[PDB]
Amino acid sequence: IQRTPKIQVYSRHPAENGKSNFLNCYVSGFHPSDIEVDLLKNGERIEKVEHSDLSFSKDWSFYLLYYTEFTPTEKDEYACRVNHVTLSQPKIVKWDRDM
Amino acid sequence: RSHSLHYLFMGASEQDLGLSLFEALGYVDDQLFVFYDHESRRVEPRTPWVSSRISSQMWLQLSQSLKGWDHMFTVDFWTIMENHNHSKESHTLQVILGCEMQEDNSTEGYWKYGYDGQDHLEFCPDTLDWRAAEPRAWPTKLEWERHKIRARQNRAYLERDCPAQLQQLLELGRGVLDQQVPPLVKVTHHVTSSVTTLRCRALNYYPQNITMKWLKDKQPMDAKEFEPKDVLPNGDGTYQGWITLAVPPGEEQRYTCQVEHPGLDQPLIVIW
């Protein structure tokens, strides 16, 4: 069976403008494992992004974590862009500053 | 309080393209300590206490143990694939194996095979055989069952070799593995004319198991009043969690967040 990824974007600590933080994008519950994840800064794919090791849960679904060090501002917008075989076009989830 | 050690294997076949993919991981008490690639074929460490050079006595057999499993996994992958009459197709095979030691040293082991993301074969040590989770797994089950020696060796690994490796790991692990760091608890909010959304976050904590709940007037709220917590990882080996509560503006003060974690001496209660 194929499973579409669940996407969650959040910060390491509650966002405080000018204060260093981490933007995380956790993809999980998907199958097969071939997945491509991008962190976006105002539409611009961010480079120098880290990721945990591909792993999977009891139900055999896979989960991967993507994260980058970063300092937010008021003009800055962040999101996570995910594409998987179960998805027609890339899906984009915006980073809600409250998360 | 019991302890665990389990390995995770994953790999994929290629559409008529020979060879496959592969990668293994080792966890002790749900803490990832070892990574293994096939592309690089190198055994990397994932924690400070279990390093390549740092106490490299174990890193030797552990690096052997995985290369061995790699071969076995490959053989198994081919066996399972060929027993489905699968070739020009692309498939995946995942394995999970490990042991669970109790406070009393009594061990419980397991070995499970997942094919194309679904349960397929599961080792049943007690009966020295395998459970086929679906019809198409029986041919393989029958193959592995032709000579009990395979089951015997397999069980021997799960009941002897594995626990011994767990003990040895729990050794160079003391001080870091059992180390628990409590969460920083913060209650943020998002206010609007119609409703205020309270958010309670538990940050940079470990181990992952935690307890978070809302209190109305210093008293517990029926669990069915707020979705259960959400637990997420940070890349650094710590975790965070959060719960949400929608309340009428003004009433914020009547709600407090209560968080419990072994790292905390007693339940921690935070105001909005």
UniProtKB/Swiss-Prot annotation, chain A:
It is linked to Immunodeficiency 43: A disorder characterized by marked reduction in serum concentrations of immunoglobulins and albumin, and hypoproteinemia due to hypercatabolism. Patients may suffer from recurrent respiratory tract infections and severe skin disease. Amyloidosis, hereditary systemic 6: A form of hereditary systemic amyloidosis, a disorder characterized by amyloid deposition in multiple tissues resulting in a wide clinical spectrum. AMYLD6 is mainly characterized by gastrointestinal and cardiac symptoms. Neurologic involvement, sicca syndrome, and carpal tunnel syndrome may also be present. Inheritance is autosomal dominant. GO terms for cellular component: cytosol; early endosome lumen; early endosome membrane; endoplasmic reticulum; endoplasmic reticulum lumen; ER to Golgi transport vesicle membrane; external side of plasma membrane; extracellular exosome. Transmembrane segments: none annotated. The keyword Glycoprotein applies. It comes from Homo sapiens (Human). Component of the class I major histocompatibility complex (MHC). Involved in the presentation of peptide antigens to the immune system. Exogenously applied M.tuberculosis EsxA or EsxA-EsxB (or EsxA expressed in host) binds B2M and decreases its export to the cell surface (total protein levels do not change), probably leading to defects in class I antigen presentation. The keyword Acyltransferase does not apply. It is found in: Secreted; Cell surface. Residues 5-93 form the Ig-like C1-type domain. GO terms for biological process: amyloid fibril formation; antigen processing and presentation of endogenous peptide antigen via MHC class I; antigen processing and presentation of exogenous peptide antigen via MHC class II; antigen processing and presentation of exogenous protein antigen via MHC class Ib, TAP-dependent; cellular response to iron ion; cellular response to iron(III) ion; cellular response to nicotine; intracellular iron ion homeostasis. The gene is B2M. Glycans are attached at I1, K19, K41, K48, K58, K91, K94. Disulfide bonds join C25-C80. Heterodimer of an alpha chain and a beta chain. Beta-2-microglobulin is the beta-chain of major histocompatibility complex class I molecules. Polymers of beta 2-microglobulin can be found in tissues from patients on long-term hemodialysis. B2M alone (not in complex with HLA-I) interacts with M.tuberculosis EsxA (ESAT-6) and an EsxA-EsxB (CFP-10) complex; the tripartite complex can be detected in the host endoplasmic reticulum. The B2M-EsxA complex can be detected in patients with pleural tuberculosis and is stable from pH 4.0 to 8.0 and in the presence of 2M NaCl. Keywords: Amyloid, Amyloidosis, Disease variant, Disulfide bond, Glycation, Glycoprotein, Immunity, Immunoglobulin domain, MHC I, Pyrrolidone carboxylic acid, Secreted, Signal. Its main location: secreted. One of its GO terms (molecular function) is peptide antigen binding. The modification Pyrrolidone carboxylic acid is found at Q2.
UniProtKB/Swiss-Prot annotation, chain B:
Keywords: Cell membrane, Disease variant, Disulfide bond, Glycoprotein, Ion transport, Iron, Iron transport, Membrane, Signal, Transmembrane, Transmembrane helix, Transport. Residues 182-272 form the Ig-like C1-type domain. Residues 1-89 are annotated as: Alpha-1. Its main location: membrane. Glycans are attached at N85, N105, N209. It is a single-pass type I membrane protein. Residues 1-272 are extracellular. It comes from the Eukaryota. It is found in: Cell membrane. Disulfide bonds join C99-C162, C200-C257. Residues 90-180 are annotated as: Alpha-2. One of its GO terms (cellular component) is perinuclear region of cytoplasm. Binds to transferrin receptor (TFR) and reduces its affinity for iron-loaded transferrin. Binds TFR through the extracellular domain in a pH-dependent manner. Belongs to the MHC class I family. This is Hereditary hemochromatosis protein. It comes from Homo sapiens (Human). The chain holds residues 26 to 297 of 348 of the full protein.
